[PDB]
Design an enzyme around this catalytic site. Structure first.
Site, mmCIF file in Angstrom:
data_model
loop_
_atom_site.group_PDB
_atom_site.id
_atom_site.type_symbol
_atom_site.label_atom_id
_atom_site.label_comp_id
_atom_site.label_asym_id
_atom_site.label_seq_id
_atom_site.Cartn_x
_atom_site.Cartn_y
_atom_site.Cartn_z
ATOM 1 N N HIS A 202 0.807 -1.211 0.000
ATOM 2 C CA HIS A 202 0.000 0.000 0.000
ATOM 3 C C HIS A 202 0.844 1.267 0.000
ATOM 4 O O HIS A 202 0.326 2.335 -0.337
ATOM 5 C CB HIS A 202 -0.934 0.000 1.209
ATOM 6 C CG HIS A 202 -2.152 0.851 1.035
ATOM 7 N ND1 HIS A 202 -3.112 0.591 0.080
ATOM 8 C CD2 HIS A 202 -2.565 1.961 1.693
ATOM 9 C CE1 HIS A 202 -4.065 1.503 0.159
ATOM 10 N NE2 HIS A 202 -3.756 2.345 1.131
ATOM 11 N N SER A 206 0.618 -1.142 -6.832
ATOM 12 C CA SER A 206 0.941 -2.188 -7.786
ATOM 13 C C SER A 206 1.753 -1.626 -8.946
ATOM 14 O O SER A 206 1.849 -0.412 -9.146
ATOM 15 C CB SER A 206 -0.334 -2.850 -8.312
ATOM 16 O OG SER A 206 -0.981 -3.593 -7.297
ATOM 17 N N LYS A 228 -14.020 -7.136 -12.433
ATOM 18 C CA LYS A 228 -13.042 -7.891 -13.201
ATOM 19 C C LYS A 228 -12.442 -9.040 -12.411
ATOM 20 O O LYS A 228 -12.097 -10.068 -13.003
ATOM 21 C CB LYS A 228 -11.919 -6.980 -13.692
ATOM 22 C CG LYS A 228 -11.157 -7.542 -14.872
ATOM 23 C CD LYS A 228 -9.833 -6.840 -15.043
ATOM 24 C CE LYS A 228 -9.077 -7.371 -16.236
ATOM 25 N NZ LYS A 228 -7.773 -6.683 -16.370
ATOM 26 N N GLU A 272 4.895 -34.325 -3.755
ATOM 27 C CA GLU A 272 3.824 -33.800 -4.583
ATOM 28 C C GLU A 272 4.393 -32.928 -5.696
ATOM 29 O O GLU A 272 5.538 -32.473 -5.639
ATOM 30 C CB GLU A 272 2.832 -33.012 -3.731
ATOM 31 C CG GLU A 272 1.918 -33.889 -2.886
ATOM 32 C CD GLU A 272 0.951 -34.702 -3.723
ATOM 33 O OE1 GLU A 272 0.628 -34.273 -4.850
ATOM 34 O OE2 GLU A 272 0.512 -35.772 -3.253
HETATM 35 C C1 HEM Z 1 -1.631 -16.083 0.280
HETATM 36 C C2 HEM Z 1 -0.568 -15.568 -0.327
HETATM 37 C C3 HEM Z 1 -0.536 -14.256 -1.010
HETATM 38 C C4 HEM Z 1 -1.507 -13.316 -1.188
HETATM 39 C C5 HEM Z 1 -2.935 -13.377 -0.716
HETATM 40 C C6 HEM Z 1 -0.915 -12.245 -1.908
HETATM 41 C C7 HEM Z 1 -1.654 -11.122 -2.273
HETATM 42 C C8 HEM Z 1 -1.128 -10.123 -3.045
HETATM 43 C C9 HEM Z 1 -1.875 -9.076 -3.590
HETATM 44 C C10 HEM Z 1 -3.349 -8.831 -3.414
HETATM 45 C C11 HEM Z 1 -1.025 -8.323 -4.314
HETATM 46 C C12 HEM Z 1 -1.435 -7.094 -5.058
HETATM 47 C C13 HEM Z 1 -2.151 -7.498 -6.350
HETATM 48 C C14 HEM Z 1 -1.228 -8.095 -7.390
HETATM 49 O O1 HEM Z 1 -0.077 -7.661 -7.552
HETATM 50 O O2 HEM Z 1 -1.624 -9.000 -8.136
HETATM 51 C C15 HEM Z 1 0.249 -8.891 -4.225
HETATM 52 C C16 HEM Z 1 1.361 -8.396 -4.840
HETATM 53 C C17 HEM Z 1 2.567 -9.063 -4.815
HETATM 54 N N1 HEM Z 1 2.882 -10.210 -4.215
HETATM 55 FE FE1 HEM Z 1 1.693 -11.254 -3.233
HETATM 56 N N2 HEM Z 1 0.365 -12.507 -2.181
HETATM 57 C C18 HEM Z 1 0.666 -13.700 -1.668
HETATM 58 C C19 HEM Z 1 1.870 -14.383 -1.685
HETATM 59 C C20 HEM Z 1 3.018 -13.910 -2.301
HETATM 60 C C21 HEM Z 1 4.187 -14.649 -2.494
HETATM 61 C C22 HEM Z 1 4.363 -16.068 -2.010
HETATM 62 C C23 HEM Z 1 5.079 -13.830 -3.182
HETATM 63 C C24 HEM Z 1 6.465 -14.088 -3.649
HETATM 64 C C25 HEM Z 1 7.107 -15.236 -3.475
HETATM 65 C C26 HEM Z 1 4.413 -12.591 -3.390
HETATM 66 C C27 HEM Z 1 4.945 -11.535 -4.076
HETATM 67 C C28 HEM Z 1 4.175 -10.453 -4.471
HETATM 68 C C29 HEM Z 1 4.723 -9.376 -5.302
HETATM 69 C C30 HEM Z 1 6.118 -9.216 -5.834
HETATM 70 C C31 HEM Z 1 3.724 -8.517 -5.505
HETATM 71 C C32 HEM Z 1 3.774 -7.234 -6.279
HETATM 72 C C33 HEM Z 1 3.259 -7.477 -7.687
HETATM 73 C C34 HEM Z 1 3.107 -6.172 -8.423
HETATM 74 O O3 HEM Z 1 2.859 -5.114 -7.820
HETATM 75 O O4 HEM Z 1 3.231 -6.143 -9.660
HETATM 76 N N3 HEM Z 1 3.160 -12.675 -2.862
HETATM 77 N N4 HEM Z 1 0.172 -10.003 -3.449
HETATM 78 C C1 LIG Z 2 -3.775 -4.439 -4.226
HETATM 79 O O1 LIG Z 2 -5.084 -4.755 -4.684
HETATM 80 C C2 LIG Z 2 -5.815 -5.582 -3.859
HETATM 81 C C3 LIG Z 2 -5.955 -5.369 -2.487
HETATM 82 O O2 LIG Z 2 -5.352 -4.306 -1.859
HETATM 83 C C4 LIG Z 2 -6.720 -6.231 -1.710
HETATM 84 C C5 LIG Z 2 -6.857 -5.988 -0.231
HETATM 85 C C6 LIG Z 2 -7.348 -7.331 -2.310
HETATM 86 C C7 LIG Z 2 -8.195 -8.291 -1.498
HETATM 87 C C8 LIG Z 2 -7.438 -9.425 -0.864
HETATM 88 C C9 LIG Z 2 -7.395 -9.711 0.428
HETATM 89 C C10 LIG Z 2 -7.659 -8.681 1.484
HETATM 90 C C11 LIG Z 2 -7.114 -11.098 0.942
HETATM 91 C C12 LIG Z 2 -7.165 -11.162 2.460
HETATM 92 C C13 LIG Z 2 -7.040 -12.529 3.061
HETATM 93 C C14 LIG Z 2 -7.042 -12.852 4.352
HETATM 94 C C15 LIG Z 2 -6.675 -11.896 5.447
HETATM 95 C C16 LIG Z 2 -7.442 -14.224 4.819
HETATM 96 C C17 LIG Z 2 -8.673 -14.186 5.702
HETATM 97 C C18 LIG Z 2 -8.570 -15.012 6.948
HETATM 98 C C19 LIG Z 2 -9.481 -15.155 7.908
HETATM 99 C C20 LIG Z 2 -10.918 -14.769 7.746
HETATM 100 C C21 LIG Z 2 -9.112 -15.709 9.255
HETATM 101 C C22 LIG Z 2 -9.854 -16.970 9.655
HETATM 102 C C23 LIG Z 2 -11.169 -16.735 10.336
HETATM 103 C C24 LIG Z 2 -12.373 -17.169 9.974
HETATM 104 C C25 LIG Z 2 -12.866 -17.157 8.559
HETATM 105 C C26 LIG Z 2 -13.338 -17.726 10.983
HETATM 106 C C27 LIG Z 2 -14.634 -18.242 10.383
HETATM 107 C C28 LIG Z 2 -15.558 -18.843 11.399
HETATM 108 C C29 LIG Z 2 -16.010 -20.093 11.461
HETATM 109 C C30 LIG Z 2 -15.742 -21.121 10.406
HETATM 110 C C31 LIG Z 2 -16.835 -20.569 12.624
HETATM 111 C C32 LIG Z 2 -18.169 -21.187 12.245
HETATM 112 C C33 LIG Z 2 -18.862 -21.836 13.406
HETATM 113 C C34 LIG Z 2 -20.086 -21.621 13.862
HETATM 114 C C35 LIG Z 2 -20.440 -21.732 15.314
HETATM 115 C C36 LIG Z 2 -21.230 -21.247 12.970
HETATM 116 C C37 LIG Z 2 -7.213 -7.534 -3.681
HETATM 117 O O3 LIG Z 2 -7.845 -8.614 -4.238
HETATM 118 C C38 LIG Z 2 -6.453 -6.665 -4.460
HETATM 119 O O4 LIG Z 2 -6.283 -6.839 -5.814
HETATM 120 C C39 LIG Z 2 -7.488 -6.849 -6.573
#
Ligand code: HEM
Ligand SMILES: COc1c(O)c(C)c(C/C=C(\C)CC/C=C(\C)CC/C=C(\C)CC/C=C(\C)CC/C=C(\C)CCC=C(C)C)c(O)c1OC
Ligand SMILES: CCCCCCCCCCCCCCCCCC(=O)OC[C@H](COP(=O)([O-])OCC(O)COP(=O)([O-])OC[C@@H](COC(=O)CCCCCCCCCCCCCCCCC)OC(=O)CCCCCCCCCCCCCCCCC)OC(=O)CCCCCCCCCCCCCCCCC
Ligand SMILES: CCCCCCCCCCCCCCCCCC(=O)OC[C@H](COP(=O)([O-])OCC(O)COP(=O)([O-])OC[C@@H](COC(=O)CCCCCCCCCCCCCCCCC)OC(=O)CCCCCCCCCCCCCCCCC)OC(=O)CCCCCCCCCCCCCCCCC
Ligand SMILES: CCCCCCCCCCCCCCCC(=O)OC[C@H](COP(=O)([O-])OCC[N+](C)(C)C)OC(=O)CCCCCCCCCCCCCCC
Ligand SMILES: CCCCCCCCCCCCCCCC(=O)OC[C@H](COP(=O)(O)OCCN)OC(=O)CCCCCCCCCCCCCCC
Ligand SMILES: CCCCCCCCCCCCCCCCCC(=O)OC[C@H](COP(=O)(O)OCCN)OC(=O)CCCCCCCCCCCCC
Ligand code: HEC
Ligand code: HEM
Ligand SMILES: COc1c(O)c(C)c(C/C=C(\C)CC/C=C(\C)CC/C=C(/C)CC/C=C(\C)CC/C=C(\C)CCC=C(C)C)c(O)c1OC
Ligand SMILES: CCCCCCCCCCCCCCC(=O)O[C@H](COC(=O)CCCCCCCCCCCC)COP(=O)(O)O
Ligand SMILES: CCCCCCCCCCCCCCCCCC(=O)O[C@H](COC(=O)CCCCCC)COP(=O)(O)OCCN
EC number: 7.1.1.8
Lengths: 383, 92, 53, 42, 74, 245
Positions: A202, A206, A228, A272
């Site tokens: 942030h 990007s 999108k 795997e």
């Molecule tokens: C659950 C795992 C991850 C999530 C949810 C996540 C999420 C994101 C998001 C939302 C962005 C901004 C949107 C985008 O660039 O497409 C981003 C950017 C980026 N992430 Fe991740 N990311 C993850 C894991 C990783 C890993 C494993 C790497 C590298 C090994 C990584 C490297 C980057 C980089 C370099 C960017 C910048 C891309 C750009 O701005 O062009 N991220 N990530």
């Molecule tokens: C830069 O541009 C962005 C960008 O800034 C963001 C934020 C996103 C959005 C992405 C995210 C914010 C991903 C965030 C992911 C996480 C933080 C993972 C979420 C994890 C959790 C919710 C923690 C686990 C907790 C629960 C879900 C508990 C649920 C409860 C249960 C199952 C209990 C149920 C039982 C009963 C009694 C009913 C983008 O997609 C994106 O590009 C388009």
């Protein structure tokens, strides 16, 4: 001002997913990040509801996963959506880790965003490896023995760490019962590292495929990249639905359906498909200590990549030879995971050494020298 | 609030780019125009254009590692064949 | 008009979204179930048990 | 060229722009996505 | 009623392609038969088999008799 | 030779995205299990109630589970006593402990087939080609160890499982001919049911999910383009400002 910007809790949602200014020309390769966020929620939610029926004892670990598949209402949907979502999680992550390397996303001022990604990369390998031994299949017992006995190469200290990690003298009840309690913890650490991952995203935003400044043309995140992202969400949930309802056991290995046996080894201990290539890097070195150093370096070599690249242009888009050797390295990794599927036999050992050498030399020799002439071809071609 | 560092992005109003002047934009409401207007002639002529540009960047890099794996697979097949054990013992 | 009755109020626009989704749950379920049994006639349990007569 | 003169958008534009017909077609497509989505979420 | 695969297996055994593969099996089998009768064969630690030839014959009939079998079977 | 001969693809009736099991073949496969491979193999993960409404009727299954015996809770003075089986109990194997299995079968451990279909590479094709893939004599050049039979499909060649499938060793309740190829096609069908008793419902819930999601996926493209229509056709012009300022 508006309530969505005035409230303490709704202003964080506003500045991250609603009013966030995005580049107006990012293509479908930038949708991969939100797909990993979708898949992280899938693993956790399908895991909490499936943790209500799983016993971590070595006696009941295997038998309980069958009870989930045969007795729980829609229990087979839970386990195929969780076993296949783990494999789909890595395919999107490689396409996120490869798009970053192609468009030069690692370069400054986004090095911290690059290093936090590598930390996330490791914790997910451990999380998937830990959850793999929870099933206590024949492949998971021996995948646990080989990987955990790898630290016996650290001198004078290895024999105590291995005995400390196993909780005993081998893989037995103390091992599985602590592997599951760890497997429930680490996803909450990844979720905390993703929060720190989006905090470093942030500050600068990007990147764009042109590799130039994106502050001239911005559009809001809502109603443009919210709809999108909905295009790929439905395509991801459709290909996932094909692998869950029509061919659930294609990606896995059939030997995991045997209860783990400490006396008889499988015909071929193979990891795997996502850990398959690094298995070849480990097995290329004809030594035990040197294998661990070489195996782990391949992850750590990505860290020097912001320094070796000597180009004044981000990306491979306007470069003929830097775009040229990239696909060999892509394919060399695709070839690297091919030998690990084949046994240790002539001439796969010789292939195993040259291929892993060209893998490491891309970061350390080709990327720095081709990036150097490219600066010169750019200079005299215009002068 | 506490002061923050120096970044390379702002927000709506102070995004941080260069000053621009003399550039004009036109747009039309999507309620007044027909989407899907040119999906054909784009699925045929536009895709062929892009393919013909970026296809030797992927083929030759895939054309080297396919002949390299095949001449090793069909060599491993002879080394472990009944006619190629004599070469096996000199490489084993 | 058709617009004035349905799409003008967001209270009744989402009401007919839920009303149409209520009907689609049962109609689509029966439509898919019948074709699936018809395409597999002579194999299902109710056909083997019917053969015992 | 004068700014007041505007660029050609003719191939993009619909022949007859009627608001009641136009907003009804868009709303039906959005409504269909919502109707199937409510079923999937349930 | 005899089994429906053994007799169908015989139909392709005496085809033009099958006869050249069963004969190629016999030429290996006859030379192994005279290799297994020589002196010093027991301690020669290199015995030639016809598994390569046997696998070639057995693989051919399967590829030819795979789709034709299950229609006979109820 | 040591990988084992690759088995070909046969014409199973349940392959394809819309096919269910032939529930007449599940009923017949269960009959040739009980009399052929019931002696040396186990089925420990199959309850009795799952057979109701799939292969047999409820009164048929409440009598099959009563031929066996189960251990009951102790009597008034703690002595043990037995009870007849009910619909909540599981199918009993032939051997009490792992040692007694290896004694009857020359030391070899016969596996539990409640998961054999998803646990041997070769899927349904490997079990079928196993029991019918036995040559009358081993190929020239190989002398088998005593007590072991040759079978090319088995990885490594030599196996400890004999031939159990002959002709007319079983009589069916619907007059089907009992050939070696006929039964081997049936047990693999019955055993695939045991490993996947959710087979039919999974494939019909999939058709519902694919049709719903494939039209949601298409509807989203129209909505994406409708909302992106103002930026796709946006047109820019550039007129250089005067250098007076
Ligand atoms: C659950 C795992 C991850 C999530 C949810 C996540 C999420 C994101 C998001 C939302 C962005 C901004 C949107 C985008 O660039 O497409 C981003 C950017 C980026 N992430 Fe991740 N990311 C993850 C894991 C990783 C890993 C494993 C790497 C590298 C090994 C990584 C490297 C980057 C980089 C370099 C960017 C910048 C891309 C750009 O701005 O062009 N991220 N990530
Ligand atoms: C830069 O541009 C962005 C960008 O800034 C963001 C934020 C996103 C959005 C992405 C995210 C914010 C991903 C965030 C992911 C996480 C933080 C993972 C979420 C994890 C959790 C919710 C923690 C686990 C907790 C629960 C879900 C508990 C649920 C409860 C249960 C199952 C209990 C149920 C039982 C009963 C009694 C009913 C983008 O997609 C994106 O590009 C388009
Ligand atoms: C494939 C190529 C092809 O056929 O066209 C490519 C062709 C290429 O156009 P382009 O401008 O050169 O490139 C567009 C960009 O690549 C991408 O720009 P875009 O987002 O505007 O395009 C969306 C893109 C979809 O893009 C994606 O989702 C990412 C790509 C994934 C791989 C391809 C799909 C698998 O469309 C497709 O590719 C649809 C493929 C399936 C048909 O684009 C189209 O023809 C798009 C329209 C396709 C049909 C859409 C139909 C919508 C109407 C459905 C109404 C509701 C029906 C159900 C009711 C219930
Ligand atoms: C033969 C290819 C035909 C397409 C074509 O124009 O060929 C050249 C075309 C390259 O055109 P370009 O303008 O030179 O470069 C594309 C840009 O990256 C610009 O990318 P984009 O906005 O065109 O999207 C790239 C890709 C985006 O595709 C994805 O990112 C896949 C999304 C999958 C989501 C679910 C993943 C689940 C886990 C894995 C399974 O979708 C398409 O290629 C749509 C084409 C219609 O080839 C492709 O992009 C083939 C992509 C196939 C996937
Ligand atoms: C998951 C459960 C899905 C429940 C239904 C979601 C789909 C739905 O109902 O969307 C339609 C409504 C209104 O959407 P709208 O685009 O604002 O409607 C047009 C505006 N009129 C002309 C009516 C004033 O949308 C809304 O009111 C917002 C729904 C937000 C869902 C998330
Ligand atoms: C959250 C994590 C899980 C969801 C993400 C993965 C999606 C994969 C396919 C769906 C499997 C789920 C299932 O069970 O779908 C089964 C249903 C059919 O079930 P049924 O109505 O016959 O009966 C109920 C089961 N006896 O299919 C569908 O209509 C799937 C349509 C999906 C559309 C999603 C829309 C938004 C969902 C938001 C949820 C809040
Ligand atoms: C894997 C994806 C890795 C990142 C994307 C990538 O490498 O794409 C490169 C190439 C086309 O990308 P370009 O940036 O050249 O497209 C705009 C051209 N004016 O993409 C291709 O040539 C197609 C790659 C398809 C996989
Ligand atoms: C005569 C006893 C006997 C009968 C009857 C029998 N088997 Fe076996 N089976 C064995 C033994 C013993 C083994 C272990 C052999 C070993 O793995 O080498 C075995 C192994 C197997 C295997 C494991 C093969 C693998 O590759 O590991 C399968 C599958 C199998 N049997 C299926 C069946 C089926 C299906 C049936 C009848 C429907 C059946 N068996 C009937 C004795 C029997
Ligand atoms: C990113 C997060 C996660 C990943 C990548 C992951 C991955 C995996 C994998 C690969 C397996 C083995 C699947 C198989 O082959 O059967 C597994 C099993 C399991 N996971 Fe997770 N998991 C995650 C999060 C969770 C969470 C949060 C929980 C519980 C709250 C959980 C509970 C389980 C359980 C109980 C099993 C064993 C059940 C079974 O697979 O049969 N997982 N996990
Ligand atoms: C597959 O190879 C392995 C591996 O075998 C293990 C044990 C771990 C480590 C996993 C644990 C046993 C738990 C330690 C994990 C943490 C990140 C600590 C978090 C909590 C403190 C790995 O990270 C790993 O991948 C490199
Ligand atoms: C982290 C996991 C998800 C990643 C983020 C991807 C973004 C997708 C979220 C979907 C929200 C889109 C609707 C926005 C909205 O409220 O628009 C509202 C109303 O729009 C609608 O008609 C809603 C259409 C219903 C589709 C919702 C289906 C959800 C599918 C599940 C996705 C997550 C599991 C605002 O509309 P406006 O454009 O007038 O401002
Ligand atoms: C982190 C993201 C959380 C998003 C969801 C929470 C949004 C809450 C909006 C309502 C609100 O702030 O009302 C609060 C009261 O909330 C409560 O009493 C408990 C809220 C708990 C929420 C638990 C999830 C009133 O907010 P207030 O009127 O003070 O406005 C401040 C700025 N004008």
């Amino acid at each position: 001002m508006a309530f969505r910007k005035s409230n303490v809790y709704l202003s964080l949602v506003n500045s991250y997913i609603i009013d966030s200014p995005q580049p107006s020309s990012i293509n479908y390769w930038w949708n991969m990040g939100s797909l990993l966020g979708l898949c992280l929620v899938i693993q956790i939610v399908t895991g909490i509801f499936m943790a209500m029926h799983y016993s971590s004892n070595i006696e009941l670990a295997f038998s309980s996963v069958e009870h989930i598949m045969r007795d729980v209402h829609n229990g087979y949907i839970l386990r195929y959506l969780h076993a296949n979502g783990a494999s789909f999680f890595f395919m999107v992550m490689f396409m996120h880790m490869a798009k970053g390397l192609y468009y030069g996303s690692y370069r400054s001022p986004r090095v911290t965003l690059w290093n936090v990604g590598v930390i996330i990369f490791i914790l997910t390998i451990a999380t998937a490896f830990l959850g793999y031994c929870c099933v206590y299949g024949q492949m998971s017992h021996w995948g646990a023995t080989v990987i955990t006995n790898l630290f016996s190469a650290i001198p004078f200290v290895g024999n105590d760490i291995v005995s400390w990690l196993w909780g005993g003298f081998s893989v037995s009840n103390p091992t599985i019962q602590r592997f599951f309690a760890l497997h429930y913890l680490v996803p909450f650490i990844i979720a905390a590292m993703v929060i720190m991952h989006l905090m470093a995203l942030h500050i600068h935003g990007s990147s764009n495929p042109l590799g130039i400044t994106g502050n001239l043309d911005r559009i809001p995140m809502h109603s443009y990249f919210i709809f999108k992202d909905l295009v790929t969400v439905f395509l991801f949930m459709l290909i996932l639905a094909l692998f869950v309802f029509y061919s659930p056991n294609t990606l896995g290995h059939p030997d995991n359906y045997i209860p783990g046996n400490p006396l008889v080894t499988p015909a071929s201990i193979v990891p795997e498909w996502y850990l398959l290539p690094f298995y070849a890097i480990l097995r290329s070195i004809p030594d035990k200590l040197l294998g661990v150093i070489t195996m782990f370096a391949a992850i750590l070599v990505l860290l020097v990549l912001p320094f070796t690249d000597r180009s004044v242009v981000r990306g491979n888009t306007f470069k003929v030879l830097s775009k040229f050797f990239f696909f060999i390295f892509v394919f060399n990794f695709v070839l690297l995971g091919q030998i690990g599927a084949c046994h240790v036999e002539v001439p796969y050992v010789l292939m195993g050494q040259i291929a892993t050498f060209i893998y490491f030399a891309y970061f350390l020799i080709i990327v720095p020298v081709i990036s150097t002439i490219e600066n010169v071809l750019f200079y005299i071609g215009r002068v | 609030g506490p002061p923050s560092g120096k970044t390379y992005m702002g927000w709506w109003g102070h995004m941080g780019g260069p000053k621009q002047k003399g550039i004009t934009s036109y747009a039309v409401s999507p309620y007044a125009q027909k989407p899907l207007q040119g999906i054909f002639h784009n699925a045929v002529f536009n895709s062929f254009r892009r393919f013909k540009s970026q296809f030797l960047y992927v083929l030759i890099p895939a054309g080297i590692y396919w002949y390299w794996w095949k001449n090793g697979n069909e060599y491993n097949e002879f080394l472990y064949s009944k006619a190629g054990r004599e070469e096996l013992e000199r490489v084993n | 008009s058709l617009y004035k009755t349905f799409f003008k109020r967001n209270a009744v626009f989402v009401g007919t979204i839920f009303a149409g989704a209520f009907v689609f749950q049962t109609v689509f379920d029966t439509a898919i179930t019948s074709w699936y049994e018809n395409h597999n006639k002579g194999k299902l349990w109710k056909d083997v048990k019917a053969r015992i007569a | 060229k004068s700014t007041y003169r505007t660029p050609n958008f003719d191939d993009v534009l619909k022949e007859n722009n009627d608001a009641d017909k136009g907003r009804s077609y868009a709303y039906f497509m959005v409504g269909a996505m919502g109707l199937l989505s409510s079923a999937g979420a349930k | 009623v005899t089994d429906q695969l053994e007799d169908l297996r015989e139909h392709f055994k005496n085809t033009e392609e099958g006869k050249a593969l069963v004969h190629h099996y016999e030429e290996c089998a006859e030379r192994v038969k005279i290799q297994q009768q020589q002196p010093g064969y027991a301690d020669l630690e290199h015995k030639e088999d016809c598994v390569e030839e046997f696998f070639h014959l057995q693989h051919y009939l399967d590829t030819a008799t795979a789709p034709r079998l299950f229609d006979k079977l109820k | 030779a040591e990988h084992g001969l690759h088995a070909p693809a046969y014409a199973w009736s349940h392959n394809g995205p819309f096919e269910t099991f032939d529930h007449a073949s599940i009923r017949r496969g269960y009959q040739v299990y009980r009399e052929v491979c019931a002696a040396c193999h186990s089925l420990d993960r199959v309850a009795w109630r799952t057979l109701v409404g799939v292969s047999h009727t409820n009164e048929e299954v409440r009598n099959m589970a009563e031929e066996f015996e189960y251990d009951d809770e102790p009597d008034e003075q703690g002595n043990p006593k037995k009870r007849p089986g009910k619909l909540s109990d599981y199918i009993p194997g032939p051997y009490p402990n792992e040692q007694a299995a290896r004694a009857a079968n020359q030391g070899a451990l016969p596996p539990d087939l409640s998961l054999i279909v998803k646990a041997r590479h070769g899927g349904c094709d490997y079990i079928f080609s196993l029991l019918t893939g036995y040559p009358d004599e081993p190929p020239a050049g190989v002398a088998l160890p005593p007590g072991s039979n040759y079978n090319p499909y088995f990885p490594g060649g030599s196996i400890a499982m004999a031939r159990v499938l002959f002709d007319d060793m079983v009589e069916y309740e619907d007059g089907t001919p009992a050939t070696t190829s006929q039964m081997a096609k049936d047990v693999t069908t019955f055993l695939n049911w045991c490993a996947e008793p959710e087979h039919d419902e999974r494939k019909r819930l999939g058709l519902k999910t694919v049709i719903i999601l494939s039209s949601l996926y298409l509807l989203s493209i129209w909505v994406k383009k409708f909302k992106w229509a103002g930026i796709k056709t946006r047109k820019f012009v550039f007129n250089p400002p005067k250098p007076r300022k």
